[PDB]
Amino acid sequence: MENFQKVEKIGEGTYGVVYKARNKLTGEVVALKKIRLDTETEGVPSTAIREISLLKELNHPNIVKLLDVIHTENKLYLVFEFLHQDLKKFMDASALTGIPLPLIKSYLFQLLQGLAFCHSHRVLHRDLKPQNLLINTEGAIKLADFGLARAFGVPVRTYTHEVVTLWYRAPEILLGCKYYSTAVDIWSLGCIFAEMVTRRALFPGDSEIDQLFRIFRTLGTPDEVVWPGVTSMPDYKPSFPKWARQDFSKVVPPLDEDGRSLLSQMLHYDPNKRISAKAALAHPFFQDVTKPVPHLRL
Amino acid sequence: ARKRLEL
Amino acid sequence: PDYHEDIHTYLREMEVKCKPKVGYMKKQPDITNSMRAILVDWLVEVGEEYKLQNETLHLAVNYIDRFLSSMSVLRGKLQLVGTAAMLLASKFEEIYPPEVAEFVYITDDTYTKKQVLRMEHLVLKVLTFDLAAPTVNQFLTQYFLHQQPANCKVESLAMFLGELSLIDADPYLKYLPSVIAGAAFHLALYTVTGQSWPESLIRKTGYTLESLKPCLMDLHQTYLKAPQHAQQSIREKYKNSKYHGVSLLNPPETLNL
């Protein structure tokens, strides 16, 4: 309303424009997310219901803070804390130089801390991708865009119309599992971890079947031994080609043994034995972690 | 199902 | 592993914050507990009509009780409050909710679409967007993992006893969701398999069997007199083979406590 001055359009998301704004009374710089109430005439959108109610309870250094919600008759505003840019934009900028490994370790460490808080508080993010991770100039990285978030005090069903983009989609989702688990968020972080290191996306698929085959060509086509139950999963087919698992020294060569170990556990096929965000924080890979400071806006 | 609660 | 403990701990912490004023109905000039019973029972059938999750039903009741804790409501608007709570709960839990028109239609067009949408606005403001409330359903889920020899009949009977407690506010508004879930689990485990509230849950929840005794006595009475209750939607619901017809089970004469 009247207390906010719009600075510039910063993005587009969930049927609504996002503006960088400044509080005219306090000088606070915020992110304004606008929801036009009258285009589906079904009241407040369900994605907004979940985003507000869940993010309210998530106060953590590595989660973008929901500052205020302004609910008028014909509009619905969400006020977030402002961060300069996304990790995807940062990756692109560092394409020639690369993100230094200590900064990679720091980001992954913080991401896991925010995610562990998320999971410990009964919320699945379900849309973890570089575009939805925000960073500042001080070395922090935070989870953002909870438009697909779900509370899993009771099981969350899989919906084909609400899923993370292909490149960061878990194998169980592609194979048509019925319910979500926390492992789907860890898998995404695994792909993001690898992408930060190689400067290339780990599994860049054109389609659902191409996404699966790209994962199979790297991690090997899973059997009942590796992952009990695959052959019975809905979208599994016996005509799946049988690929061999590749050694991780060829997949992520700049990694040492500790990094290779963690990434392997983050991309475990069977969701039950995929590492948790909490257990990942305890991995020997983070024993010497620091908080490096990035260089932004190249 | 479809009804008006008459209390 | 541990994030299950952190979840149970967090739900236990949040269930205290989302609890309504226990005696709010005495301060309600125009509505009674019986009318509330008629409301929630109606909601049991709309969830059955539109094939909605049991969690959606539980959430709506929670919303209703909290709204009625702060706002005085006349008889003619009670159904409108329950409808908006059902729509909001549907928006939170379902993959996609029924359209608003369905909710207008299900009330026999008693209210208009604009009345429903603005009641949604009001409920959201009164509840201050705090919709992720812990339920008996959620705690039952957490408890069921400690039943390694999983029994579908026990789980179904526990859900049944859990849903029945939503109907009557007179005894159950003074019990926390986790406590109601505890009594419902023990009673179902005792009826179906003749064994008792296990140590693993005593360690987990801190609840002894005797700590659950007052709620357990109330719930066993609700179980016994369920055939004679004025509201029968839930009983009809749990006669179907989906719930192994657990509602038709003869409750034990005593509990020996």
Method: X-ray
A43 among the known binding-site residues?
no
Q: Are residues A168 and A277 in the same domain?
A: yes
Question: Could you tell me if C42 lies within 8 Å of chain B, comparing CB atoms?
Answer: yes
Give which of A141, A139, A138, A146 is closest to A118, Cα–Cα. Answer: A146
Would you state the CATH architecture of domain C20-132? Orthogonal Bundle (1.10)
- Tell me the C-alpha distance between C62 and C79, whole Å: 15
Same domain, A77 and A90: no
**Both A176 and A251 in a single domain?**
yes
If asked whether residues A104 and A207 sit together in one domain, one would say: yes
Are C3 and A153 in contact (CB < 8 Å)?
A: no
Of C248, C183, C233, the closest CA to residue C37 belongs to: C233
How far apart (Å, rounded) are the C-alpha atoms in residues C144 and C158?
A: 10
**Could you say which of A57, A71, A73 has the minimum Cβ distance to residue C132?**
A57
List CB contacts of C140: < 8 A, sequence separation 6 or more: C155, C158, C159, C162, C181, C184, C185
Rounded distance, CA C200 to CA C171, Å? 28
State the Cα–Cα distance between residues C97 and C53, nearest whole angstrom: 11
The answer to whether the C6-19+133-257 and C20-132 domains have the same CATH topology is yes
Closest CA to C188 of C128, C233, C144: C144
Which other chains touch chain A, taking contact as 3+ CB pairs less than 8 Å apart?
A: C
Nearest by Cα to C92 from A123, A1, A58, A103: A123
The candidate with the shortest Cα–Cα distance to A44, out of A1, A2, A78, A82, is A78
CB contact under 8 Å between C97 and A119, yes or no, is: no
Distance from CA of B3 to the nearest CA of C (A): 5
Residues 6+ apart with CB under 8 A from C201: C143, C146, C182, C185, C207
Structure tokens at C222: 């609700």
- Six token digits for residue C82: 């329950």
Residue A7's nearest CA partner among A78, A82, A107, A88 is: A82
- The Cα A104–Cα A93 span in angstroms is 15
Asked which of A81, A102, A119 is the last residue of a domain, the reply is A81
Which resolution in angstroms does this entry have? 2.5
- Number of separate domains in chain A: 2
Find, in chain A, the residue whose alpha carbon is nearest to that of C99: A42
- The conformation of residue A117, written as its DSSP 8-state character, comes to H
Rounded distance between C-alpha atoms, residue A126 and residue A180, angstroms: 9
Query: Where are the alpha helices (H) located in chain A, listed in sequence order?
Result: 46-55, 87-93, 101-120, 171-174, 183-198, 208-219, 248-251, 257-266, 277-281
**Tokens found for residue C221:** 């009475």
Say which residues have a Cβ less than 8 Å from residue A79's Cβ, sequence separation at least 6.
Answer: A30, A31, A32, A33, A66, A67, A68, A69, A70
C33-49 and C152-167 are packed helices; what angle lies between their axes, rounded to 10 degrees? 140
* Residue A110 in marked binding region: no
Annotated catalytic residues of A are 127
Determine the Cα–Cα distance for residues C140 and C57; give it in Å rounded to an integer. 15
Is A57 labeled as ligand-binding?
Answer: no
Answer yes or no: do C110 and B4 touch at CB < 8 A: yes
- The residue among C34, C40, C110 with the most chain B CBs within 10 A of its CB, best to mutate, is C110
The class of domain C6-19+133-257 in CATH terms is mainly alpha
* CA dist list (Å): A234 to A136, A172, A178, A183, C117: 43, 10, 9, 19, 39
Helical pair C152-167 and C54-70, crossing angle rounded to 10 deg:
20
Say whether residue A67 is in contact with chain C using an 8 A CB cutoff: no
Return the closest-CA partner of residue A69 out of A88, A54, A84: A54
Strand partners, A142: A134
CB-CB under 8 Å, C95 with A157: yes
CB contact under 8 A, C11 and A153: yes
Residue-number span of the structural domain to which A113 is assigned: 85-282
- How crowded is residue A111: how many other Cβ atoms within 10 Å of its Cβ? 24
Out of B1, B3, B7, the one facing C35 most closely (by C-beta) is B7
Q: Could you tell me the CA-to-CA distances from B2 to C59, C116, C171, C218 in Å, in that order?
A: 21, 16, 29, 32
How buried is C234 (Cβ within 10 angstroms: 0-12 exposed, 13-18 middle, 19+ buried)?
buried
Strands (E), chain A: 4-12, 17-23, 29-36, 66-71, 75-81, 85-86, 123-124, 133-135, 141-143, 150-151
Instruction: Work out the burial of residue C195: count CB atoms within 10 Å of its CB; fewer than 13 is exposed, 13-18 middle, 19 or more buried.
Output: exposed
What's the CA gap between C104 and B2, in Å, rounded? 10
**Torsion-angle region of residue C247: left (phi > 0), alpha (psi -120 to 50) or beta?**
alpha
How many whole angstroms separate alpha carbon A111 and alpha carbon A87?
A: 12
Q: Are residues A143 and A263 in the same domain?
A: yes
- Residue A176 marked in a binding site: no
For chains A and C, what is the number of CB pairs under 8 angstroms?
A: 82
Cα separation, C188 vs C153, whole angstroms:
8
Question: Among C44, C218, C99, which residue's Cα sits nearest to residue A42?
Answer: C99
Q: What is the CA radius of gyration of chain C?
A: 18
Domain at A248, CATH number: 1.10.510.10
Instruction: Count Cβ atoms below 10 Å from residue A194 Cβ, excluding itself.
Output: 22
Domain extents for chain C? 6-19+133-257, 20-132
Best CA proximity match to A134, nearest among A166, A99, A179, A86 = A86
Exposed, middle or buried: residue C36 (CB in 10 Å: 0-12, 13-18, 19+)? buried
Cα separation, C68 vs C87, in Å, equals: 17
Q: Are C153 and C135 in contact (CB under 8 A)?
A: no
Q: How far apart are CA C48 and CA A22, in angstroms?
A: 48
Crossing angle between the packed helical segments C54-70 and C136-144, to the nearest 10 degrees: 140
Residue A219, C-beta contacts closer than 8 angstroms, at least 6 positions apart: A245, A246, A267, A269
Rounded distance between C-alpha atoms, residue C38 and residue C97, angstroms: 23
Q: What is the DSSP letter of A162?
A: B
Breaks in chain A (C to N over 2.5 Å), named by the residue before each, are: none
C75 vs B contacts (CB less than 8 Å): 7
Question: Do A273 and A171 share a structural domain?
Answer: yes
Tell me the backbone φ, ψ of residue A79, rounded to 5 degrees: -105, 115
Helix (H) or strand (E) run with residue C45 in it: helix C33-49
Q: Name, in order, each residue with C-beta under 8 angstroms of C211's C-beta and a sequence gap of 6 or more.
A: none
C-alpha distances in Å from residue C53, one per residue of A176, A241, A292, C23, C99: 21, 39, 47, 29, 16
The answer to whether residue A297 is domain-embedded is: no
